[PDB]
Structures are given as structure tokens and as C-alpha cells.
RNA sequence: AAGAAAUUCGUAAGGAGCUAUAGAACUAGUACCGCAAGGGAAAGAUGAAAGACUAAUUAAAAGUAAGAACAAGCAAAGAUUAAACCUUGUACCUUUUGCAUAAUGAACUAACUAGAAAACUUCUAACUAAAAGAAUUACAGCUAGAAACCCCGAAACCAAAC
RNA sequence: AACGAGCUUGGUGAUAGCUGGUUACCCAAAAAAUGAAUUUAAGUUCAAUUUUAAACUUGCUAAAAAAACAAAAUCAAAAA
RNA sequence: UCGGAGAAAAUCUCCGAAUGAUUAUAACCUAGACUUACAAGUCAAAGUAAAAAUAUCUUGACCCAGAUA
């Protein structure tokens, strides 16, 4: 370019000739000379002046602001509450228009995290991705998807394309390995069991219109049917569907990742996953 | 400058140089093992995890010992693990009221016993709780033993 | 001049010597030598079995799970006598 | 003292040569001399 | 020739590949250079912050003082407030006093600690690339041999090629650099020699003319424009990575 | 004020000495070394300011956790008093609430 | 207010506004009526259905409660069937 | 002993100040001085004053018997013409 | 951040569609993000300053200047008012713009 | 005001410090003060050689001397041929009140002697629906840089010695 | 050798809404002492004023008739 | 501390309230406003619901303890 050009004829760089961009730092004010000195900007001798006035909130011995209106509940248990990111249908598109998550295999939250399309933070209470409806109407991918909560029209768009929607329960421990599995697997422990859903959270993952993980399978052709009336399309039957192996895939409730059973340790550093023999050992794990 | 070594490291170096490096292995042991008496004072938490009543939250519950004051009067006879409680108290027992100074003592008796391997008899300052963990060993022999 | 050979860190597995009292107490748990293993896998040394809960430290983890983790059949039965209650 | 002015001597001299001509200690003691020149100002 | 696909609508740059066996082999081949690592636009406030945080992040002063509370003696009152026609004192180790404490002093050792993000300090090595290149001050040469290893021949090379009173050279990696160009470097104190993991803005500025071997130009090429097409770390990029060594 | 009468000896700076022609250089260790190191485990001072920076109280309090039980008597005794002045000062005195 | 706290050296949030007002995203805070749990059988219809209501504050009350909570307590937090969902954004504001 | 070298530096011109005034140095011919070329000098004078000279004649005016003694002194240890001739016309 | 799949018909469902290829042969070239988007970036200042950003512009900066008062005048009715930061390369705009600005790159093919 | 844990992470000789009122109190816990516990200083300066006779360098501080003064006045300014005469002019800092002929403080010289922090705001850049070198924030944001909040002084109170 | 309660060291840089002090230049703008609560009236917090930056559109004076009590404070179209 | 009357809004001149009895039992919800440092305090269309419209006349925060469901 033309800048560059004057680089040629001018003379060399050198720490000699920096210079930071202009206005980038401001001049500090030291209290010597006759405008900052004196007083020194803290007024007439009193508290205000000496550097003892009051705490913040204090209003000169009436009862404060924040002292006087009623103690409410509004944060209660605020620590305790459970929090799911919301993911839009938008987004989800626009990721596989992308490239960003691979539509040909299942989707789970470990691949979202992995194509940071969503970020995880167990640490303040995420427990999972809630399916957002905003989007659905230009919603046209076919797609294999878990998320722990989901919509009635979230679903149905998922599902009126020909794709399959599931909501797993993941516990706090759980979530952290799914989130980021590599970070676990350097540390050398066996892969630990899914835990059920808390007594709170069993009806939604045990009920078949929610597309619980822990519902009756048999019930789902009707709450597939029943949807399909209500939003004006037609079921698409996906057992004609030549990739109906990879829709139909789906973990075990006590399985965290789609091929590691629990209770198996992944040498990362020899490429292998050992494994126990131990009866014990195998009855915990398979339980 | 720095101490090479944190002050608290300072009593198991000294054990390990000089004259007491040459102290026999076994009797190490017993000085370096540090093992909290059984409770005595203060009731013990039977599990490791509660329910918070506030909130209704399991959380951890761990056990924290009072501290005793042993008088050198106690090294001279058989108190089954009972010392001076000092500490304070609220008036009323409520804490808006004044904190004050109370110490808590055991009661003790003179009482004479009997070592059957020692074939002798003799007289000891004992608290109840004493003669209770000697009965409940089975015999004063026992009770020194275990 | 030539400049020193570039810094870098140590390329294997480490475990400290445990007389030493200056190493530094977590470098000596149960959990710092299977970082070990899973950093450098089977070089560490680490026998594999000892990667697994051991005898009694497993009857910990069942007695602890079934204490605090109803199975499913339970927490459906409770949850139907609720309704039942509230109906 | 990691930093310790080093121009005191010329500061001091130039209000000292607008008071060499006064009579007394105004025109050689700074502190008088300075109060002194500044009135003639 | 760029192993990395360069931008379709930016055309390549190019240099002069250079031998140091011989005094008058200056041209014995033709290179070209990704233009988003040595054709970037001209920012020296950039450089001016790289080079500034390389100076400062080390920094550690060891400046202190004692204070008025750590000044031998001091605790008594030196006389009474009142019937005495002096000044009121309570210590004689306050601030006023000679030998007394330091009021605003340096505070015992101090960081200057921070870092920049990890893009604008590998921008910084683009930057500078682009400007020793385009101030024609850069070499590229295919390796480093030297027919001899007396210091005489280095420093007469860089008269004849009008090279600079200071000169950087840089190798691909320590273990390998020829035998020969360390002795005769060893003993120069303007010509300093360093691996490619060492190169930094700070150098670049001090030493006028920089000379790298063809090999560390694709190994700076990749590690730089890596940057560009990059997500955010989910965890730190020692950790397995799909892609990343 | 009084001033020197003569000139103080001449200071010579060798601006090319191994300390100053190889400064800076191991500071791209990351990102030119896959980061393997971080250049922060390059800086060398007091245990307790390695890679950290803080104000005066933090500093104070940090020196304390890392080097803490091992400092000396009359050390401790100091540090353990500047940390209470400071901390009287930072959240009760001053201009701004 | 704790500015630099000796064990952190961070400032600490003032947990008597934790519990009297909530926080909205978007800047707002919303508190309770002072005495609307008090005596109700002297005031007037009209006056307890005014205590009843959720209120907003003002922008010096706000600037106040945002000196004395920490930053935890101003992030975005994504609740399942969160009854405050709407009240987190403002729209159609020009101003 | 305060740290710098600047503030010494500018009291050594102070003392060459006072040294002058005591001890007033004996004034010297400029020429002895640096920035000094005849030739260009008197080609100034003549410019100076508006006027025209043969540079040769002007210098000679410039020459005093006196200074030729002088140099055949110093060379006892090209006879000129000296200013006489025109000083009387 | 991968390359983007070659996708049968454009525009994208999303919206999303790659730059055209041949280049345009305008002075200026703009580049896509690191996301493959065009940065049109809005933002604001104070609270009330509403400006609309055009990042990682090359060639003739000025140029496009001139084509973007030409192109948004007629929306407003009077100049816009526009700062080019010729150091960074970019374009700043008084107010909000983005979403014509968008898809009038998309035209030019950038 | 105080403030965790479960859990995860972790393999390493120097100085943009002081240079004799500074830096240790330190030439010394000495001299000296105190019955005692205890408190606690000040300072030195030649040269390669003193078996060269112990040097030099500096209108340079206040203070004096060389050289007392000469109607008239905040001591100067405007001037002037002329130092003074003529003309104009109610010392300073703080403080009263935004005024003093109030009132506080100042014999003079040299040295020393008092604004310090990033929650929000603003400015400069990097990347941008994402930013950050793990843990954080995000409905144009996020990251980094820059930008800030004094000194001296009681009567008291408590613990342990004497 | 200062006893309504000794002295010394430490806590301790005690605290002081009180007294004093708070070190170069230049340009610019600029209030108050109205109101309110306060063991609060030698202090502080809020309003009000002032100020800096930003956004965009009416502001100041004057203002008829006509109104609210009445032979100028509110209010106040067009104008200038 | 608050309310009523005069001076006439700065301090002065006077009376009362820390309720009282009557009762139709007087709901929920929601535009726009008054008043106001904050806090507290006023008025109210529309909609719905009860009934077959109406409450008439003349005051103390937070915390912390309670009571019943
Ligand atoms: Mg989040
Ligand atoms: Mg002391
Ligand atoms: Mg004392
Ligand atoms: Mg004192
Ligand atoms: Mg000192
Ligand atoms: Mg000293
Ligand atoms: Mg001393
Ligand atoms: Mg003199
Ligand atoms: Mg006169
Ligand atoms: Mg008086
Ligand atoms: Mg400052
Ligand atoms: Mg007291
Ligand atoms: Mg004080
Ligand atoms: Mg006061
Ligand atoms: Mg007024
Ligand atoms: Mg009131
Ligand atoms: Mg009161
Ligand atoms: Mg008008
Ligand atoms: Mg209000
Ligand atoms: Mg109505």
C-alpha cells in the first residue's frame, strides 16, 4: 500500500523514535503547583476535608435508604436455582451453515460447547441448553439433537423437518466431563456415572410430550402425532430415512459419552481405554 | 532474610539430627504421631453431611474440639481424659447480653485401686468418668493397657 | 553473542521424593500420582489397577449413593403418594 | 533521598538580582528578598 | 513459496534469498512472504506498546523505606504538650523529624506485572517483520553456514553488503545451529544470534538489520497467521487439541 | 544552595554488553513455542510477586501467605502492623465513599 | 463499605441490599413499600393496594446500590420459567 | 553529594563568569579567533559600504609597515607593499 | 474456526452467503471477519451516541467514504456525518446503518 | 462488619535501592541521661608516594570585614544630568465574610518536611456475536493500556516489667 | 523535682466532626450561606445550584386577550 | 410530632389528636396525575367481580418477636 511507500523513505525504527497513539494516556495531576496545590480540591477544613467522613449509606443519623424498606425474598435460594442457556434456532442454523456443528452426526452439548456456539459455566449454575423457538419459521435443517430442556415449537420445528429431539437430564459433576472431557481424562480417573434426575425434575424427563430421556417409548408416536396436527405439517416418517441409525442413536441414561461405558480410563498418551474386570467394580458401574 | 523451613516443621527437624536421630525408630513414632483424644467434652457429629434447615441444603459438618486446660495437678493421677473448660459465657444466655469469664471444672475424687500385674493398690485423684472407662474395660489393668 | 538454550519444562513423569520435608503435601496424594498417569500414560509407572476404587473404598461410594441417590422407582412412588395427598 | 532537587541555586538567583539594589536584608535573604521584588513588580 | 493459502484479493511479497558462504553470493534465489505477515499495514503505536510491555512486565523495584512506625525507638512522647513554648510532638521519629520515618515512600519490592492478549503481541511481530522488510533491512538467507569461523569474515560480510553497525541473526532451533556460526558470533557483541522462539519486537528495534534463514520464515509464518483464523481457547493450548501440536 | 565545584567522573554505559544486546529475548516463549511455558514463569523476584500485581495492602497480605511462617520475629511483628494501617486506610479514610 | 477486604482484597457486597431489592439487567432496581405489613386495619383500601405494588428507584437509589453490590450480582442470569424473563430489557426507549 | 552531572556542569559556566570579571582577559586580534576568513572578510567590507574595490589594492591598505617587521622578525628566526603609498593620495 | 461448506444455493437459510467471486474491482476491498461475516459492527458511546462501524478496510479508505455518503444521503437527507481512522482502516458513521450498510456490501460482492 | 467448603489447577545471583540530616540507632547499644526497667547521640574527607613538611578548589549561604550616619517615613516604583529631595504607594501567610489599623504564625540561612487505591464513568487500541493464555462477562460486546482519594498534634485506655 | 492516681516499654502511625500546615507555569469556567432529615445544628446525606462530555430542539426577553383572587407574582396563541 | 383558626408566607395569637361513635360493610385490577430531598402520603377513567350505586361525618420506619392457615 501507499503506507508502507513512505516507511521506505523514511528513517530506520528505533526504540529512539516510538511514540504511543495520541490521547492514549492521560496526564496525572500531582498537588504542587498553585491550581492543584493549596486545599488540594478537598475544600474548607471539616470531615470532608481531614478524610473521615462517613461509610457509604450513611445519612448523616437518620435511618438510611437501604435500611428502612422492607427485607423481601427476592434473591432467596438464588445461589440453588437451576440455569439453562438458551439456544435459538437462528443460531443453531447459522452453526451449520457454517460448518461450526456437523449436522451428520448427533448433536449433543459437548459438540456445541466444542464449536462455541454456546458457552457452558457449571461453576454458575448452568445445567444445560433450553431450545429457544426464535428462529423457526426459517428453521431447515434435519438434525439429531439433545438439550435438557426444550419448547413445544422448538420441538416441532426439529421434528417437521424429519429430525429428532431428546431432553437428557445431566448433573452438576456430569455436565463439568461433558463440557470438557479432555480435562478430565489427563487426570486419570475412570469415567463416574450419570446420576438421576432430582425428585423436582423427574415428571418433565419421564414425560413423552417433553421427549424425556426417561419416558415410556412407546408413548412418543402419539405426542409426535398430536403435535404435528396442532402446527399444520406432517409427521415424516424417519424409519424410511436412510440416516435413521444416527437419528435414532441415544446414550444411556447412565452414560455420559455415546461409546465410553462408566467405569473405563482413557490413556490418552497410549491411544488406548483401559478397562475393569473387577465384579465389584463392573456391578457399581453397571448399575 | 528467611527461615529455610516454616516454624511449625522446626520441632520434627530437631527430632531428626543429633542424638535424637539415634533415639530408637519405634519410640519416633509415638512422639511424631499426633492423634486427637476421643471426644470428652463436646458431643461429636454422628454423620459428615446435615440438612441446613434455613435453606434446606445439605452441607458439610465437620468437628471442631473445645479446647481443655490440663493443670499439672491432673499428671499426678487418672482423669479419664476430663480437663478445665475456660472460657466465656452469655448472661441469661442470651447473646445480648455481657460475656463473662467461667471455667468449667471436673469433679474429683480419691479413690483406691487395685493392679492385678502390679499386685499393689493405689490411691488415685479419678473423676467418674474414669471409674466409667475402667468398667466399661473390664478391669483397672485393662483399662491402662487398652 | 548466542542466546542460552530456550527455556522449557521438564518432558516426564515426576514424583517427588517423600522424605523430603520441603515438597509440598499435594505432590504426595493419591490424586497427584494418577495425573501422572493420564499426562504420560503407562510410562508414569502408575499400576493400572490402582486407578479404580479400592475394596472398602467402594463400599463407601454404594453406601453413600443410596443414602443421598433414591433410585428411580422410589422417586416415582414418592412423588405418586404426594399427588394422592395433594388431591 | 532517591530524587533531590538540583536547581535550588539558580531559582534562589533569580529573584535575588531583582533585589540587589535595596537596602537592609531584603536584598540578599531570600525569604525577604522574594516579598520585596514582588512589590516592585 | 507461502505453504498457507494467502488471500485472494492480496498478491504475495517477495525477497532476495541470500548465502553467507561466499562474500558476493547475495542473490542466489527468489522468496516470497505471506503479505498478512511481512505486508501488514505500518502501526507503530503497536509496536510501541509490545515494546513497552517486554520492558515492563519484568519489572521488580526493590526501592523501600522505613516508615515512621518502623524507625528504631520513637515511642515515647519527647515532652509535654503544654508550658514548654515548642512545638507539639508526640515522637521523634514522625516525619518532620531527622531520622524519622519516610511519609510517602517506596513500599517494599513492587510489580509492574500485566500482559497484553496474545493477538496484539503476535500483531507486534507482524508489524515489525513488515517494517525491517519494507526499510530494507531484512535478509532472507537458506542457511547459515559459514566457510570459516573467524570473527573477521561475519563482520566484513556485513560492511560489503551494507549491512547495519548491528546485526540479528536467527536459526530455526538451538540444537542444530552450525558449529561455525556460533563460534564466530560467540565473541561479537553487536551480532547476536538467537533461535527462532526467540524473536521479539524489543530486538528487532535494537539490532538494525535482521537475517533470517528460510526455514524460520515458514516457522514464523505459521505460528503468526495461526492467529488469525483462530477460536478462543476453551483451555489452555497445552491441553489436546483436536488440530493444534 | 551550594553545588559541586568540580565535574563528577564521566559514567560510562556499554550499551552492548550480554545483559543489554540479549534483552527481551524469550518473551514470545508462548505463542512462537506452542505454549508450552507462559512468559510469566520467566520473571524472577519474591515468591509472592511472580506473575501478580496488586496495591500496597495486597501485596502486604500476599507476602504473608506465601513466606508468612517462615519470616522472622521482629519482621513479623512489622508487616502484621502495616497491614492493619493500610487496612484502616483503604476502607475508612479518604475522599471518595 | 469493605473497599480492600484483608483476606481477597476485593470490595464486599453490602448484604442488606441483597435482601430488600432485586436487581434487572438493564439497570433497574425494584423494591418493596415500607409498612405494608403493618397495621392494615387502620389504612385505607386505596393505601394498602398502593403498598402492595413492586416499585422502582431512582437513579441516585440505584447509583447508591450499585456502589454496594458486587459485579455476581449484576450478571445476566438465565432461569427456566424466570417470572422476571420480560423485565430484564427496556424497549422503544429514546432517551 | 546529590546525584547528576548537569547541575555541575552548568556551575562551571558560573565560575567562568566570575573568573572574567576579576581577572578581565587581554583582548586579542580577531583573526586569532575561530570563523575567520580574510579573503571573504574584506569582500564583506567592500559589499558593506555600497562600493566597488580591486580586491588587490584594498588589501594592501589593510598592511602596515609595522606588521612587516614583525613577520621578517619571526622569519629571521615576499616583500609586500605596504600601505604608504596610497595613505599619502 | 473451519471454512464454511460449500452449499448448493445462496443465500444460505441463515442469511449467511460468501464473498462473490470474480473480486470486485473497486478501489477498496473489505474483508470478511474471522467468523465469515461482514464487519458492520453497531456501537455506542455515552449511553445515547449511536455510530455504525466498518472494520478491516484496505486500499482507498477515502473512497469509500464518498460511496457511502453517495448511498446513505438519500435515506436522510443531508450529508452524513463520518470519521475515517486511516491507521486502523476504518470507517465510523453517526448513527445506526448497520443493516443497510450490510447488505450493501453484499452487493459489491465484499 | 465477618466469611468458608465440596470441586478443579499447579514439575520453577540480582537492583529505572540509599550514598553521611540519606541508608541500619550504629564510627555505638558506646558517650551521655535515668535508683531501676529503660531511653539513647553526634561525626569522616590530601596525594601514586608524607621515608614528597599533609593538600587543593569556590564573585559563591545567613553572619561579618573592607567602608557608621547625614530633614521625609512597608523603604520601593515612576523617574532623573544627579545615590538621596519630587511624585505614587495602609508588609506577608492563614483567617475571619468577599473588610480590617483585627487576630494567629514567621530572627535569619542551608537541608529535610504533607494525595495513596480502579466499582462506575471518559480516552486509546486488539478481536468481534463473540472476547479473554481454564474458572469470567456478553441482546455490541469483551480484552488490554491510561486516568484516584494528605501530613503533624491530645487528655485517655489496656498488658507486662521497673 | 507535675499523683483525683507512679513510671517505663509494648498495644500504637491509638482516636481527634477540633487547631495548624499542605511545595512549578498558563488558559478557562464557577456556585452557595435556599429547602429537608439528623444526640443534628464547629458535622454529614439528599434536593437545589455549578460543572464536563454526549444526543437533538426549541429556549430567553416580551407575551395580548381570559382566566384563578384582583385594577401583578402564576398562566400565557401569534409576533418581534 | 402532626392537624384546625388568626397575624396575612419568617416568630407570634388560639383549639384539638395519638380517635370516636354510626353503619349499606366499601373487592380485585389498571390509564393519567397531585404531593415529595429520600421515606411516607393523596385522587382516579376504563375492565372484571359481588350486590341491586354508598361507607358516612367529624397517626411510628426497619429489624425482631408473635398469632392463627
Ligand atoms: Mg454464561
Ligand atoms: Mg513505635
Ligand atoms: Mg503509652
Ligand atoms: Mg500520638
Ligand atoms: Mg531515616
Ligand atoms: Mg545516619
Ligand atoms: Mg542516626
Ligand atoms: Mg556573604
Ligand atoms: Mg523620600
Ligand atoms: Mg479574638
Ligand atoms: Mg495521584
Ligand atoms: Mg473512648
Ligand atoms: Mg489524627
Ligand atoms: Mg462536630
Ligand atoms: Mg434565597
Ligand atoms: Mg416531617
Ligand atoms: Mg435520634
Ligand atoms: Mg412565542
Ligand atoms: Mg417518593
Ligand atoms: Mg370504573
Redesign the pocket.
Known sequence: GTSLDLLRSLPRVSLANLKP??????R????????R????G?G????????????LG??????P?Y?????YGFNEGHSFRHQY?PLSLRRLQYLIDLGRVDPTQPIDLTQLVNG????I?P??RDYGVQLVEEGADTFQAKINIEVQLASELAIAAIEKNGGVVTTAFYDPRSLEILC?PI?FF??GQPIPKRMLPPESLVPYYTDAKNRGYLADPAKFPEARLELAMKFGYVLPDITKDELFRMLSARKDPRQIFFGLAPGWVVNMADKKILKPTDENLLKYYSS | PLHRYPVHLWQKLRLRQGICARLPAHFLRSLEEERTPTPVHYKPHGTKFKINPKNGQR??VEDVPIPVHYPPESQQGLWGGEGLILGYRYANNDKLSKRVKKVWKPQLFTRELYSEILDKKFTVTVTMRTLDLIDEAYGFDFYILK | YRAPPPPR??????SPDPENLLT?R?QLTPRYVA?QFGRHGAISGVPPASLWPTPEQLRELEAEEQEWYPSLATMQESLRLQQQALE | ??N??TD??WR??EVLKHAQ??????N?????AV??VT??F | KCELRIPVHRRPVQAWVESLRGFEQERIGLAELHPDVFATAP?L??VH?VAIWQ??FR?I?????????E???????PW??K?SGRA?????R???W???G?????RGPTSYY???????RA?GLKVALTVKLMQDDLHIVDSLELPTADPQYLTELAQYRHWGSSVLLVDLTHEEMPKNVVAATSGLNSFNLIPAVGLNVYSMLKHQTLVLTLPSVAFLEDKLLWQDSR???L???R?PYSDFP | ???R??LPPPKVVDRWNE?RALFGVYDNI??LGN?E???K?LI?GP?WLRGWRG??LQRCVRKKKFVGNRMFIEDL?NLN?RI???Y????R????? | ????????GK?????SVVHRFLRL?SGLWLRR???????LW??????????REFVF??K??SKLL??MTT??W???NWYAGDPYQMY??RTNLRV | ?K?GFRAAFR?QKE?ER??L??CPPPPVRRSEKPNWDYHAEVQAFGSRLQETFSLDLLKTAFINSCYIKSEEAKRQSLNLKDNQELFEQ | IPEPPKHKHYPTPSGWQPPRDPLPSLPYFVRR???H?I?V?????????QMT?I??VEGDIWALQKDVEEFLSPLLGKTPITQV?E??GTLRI??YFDEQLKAWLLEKGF
Not at chain 4, 28 to 32: A, G, H, V
Not at chain 5, 102 to 106: C, E, F, K, R, T
Not at chain 7, 11 to 15: A, H, L, Q, S
Not at chain 9, 41 to 49: A, V
Request: charged share 35%.
Open positions: 497513539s495520541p490521547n492514549s494516556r492521560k496525572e495531576r500531582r498537588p504542587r503547583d498553585r491550581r496545590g493549596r486545599k488540594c478537598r474548607h477544613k471539616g470531615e470532608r476535608q481531614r478524610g473521615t467522613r462517613p461509610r450513611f445519612e448523616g443519623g437518620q435511618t435508604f435500611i428502612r424498606i422492607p427485607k442457556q462455541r456456539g454456546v458457552t459455566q461453576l454458575k470438557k480435562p489427563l487426570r | 452441607e458439610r | 519444562r521438564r518432558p516426564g513423569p515426576h509440598p499435594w495425573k | 533521598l532517591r533531590r532537587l535550588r541555586y534562589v538567583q539594589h535595596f537596602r537592609g536584608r531584603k540578599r535573604c531570600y525569604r525577604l516579598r520585596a512589590r516592585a | 502501526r503505536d503497536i506498546q520492558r515492563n519489572r523495584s526493590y526501592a523501600n523505606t522505613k516508615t515512621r512506625a524507625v528504631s525507638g520513637g515511642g515515647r512522647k509535654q504538650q508550658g507539639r510532638h508526640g515522637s521523634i514522625s516525619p518532620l531527622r531520622g524519622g519516610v511519609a510517602h515512600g517506596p500485566y500482559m497484553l492478549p496474545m493477538k496484539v500483531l477460536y478462543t481457547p483451555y489452555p493450548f491441553l | 544552595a551550594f553545588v565545584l568540580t545483559k508462548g505463542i505454549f511455558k507462559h512468559p514463569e524472577k515468591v496495591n500496597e511483628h502492623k492493619s494501617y493500610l484502616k486506610h483503604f476502607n479514610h479518604g475522599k471518595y465513599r | 463499605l469493605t473497599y480492600c477486604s484483608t483476606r481477597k470490595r464486599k457486597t453490602v448484604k439487567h413499600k415500607a409498612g405494608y405489613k403493618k397495621k387502620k389504612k385505607s383500601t386505596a393505601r394498602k393496594k398502593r403498598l428507584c431512582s441516585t437509589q450499585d456502589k459485579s455476581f449484576k450478571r445476566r430484564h430489557d | 553529594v546525584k556551575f565560575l566570575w573568573r570579571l576579576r | 471477519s474471522r467468523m461475516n464487519p459492527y453497531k456501537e455506542i458511546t455515552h449511553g445515547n451516541r462501524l472494520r478491516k481512522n491507521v486502523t453517526k448513527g
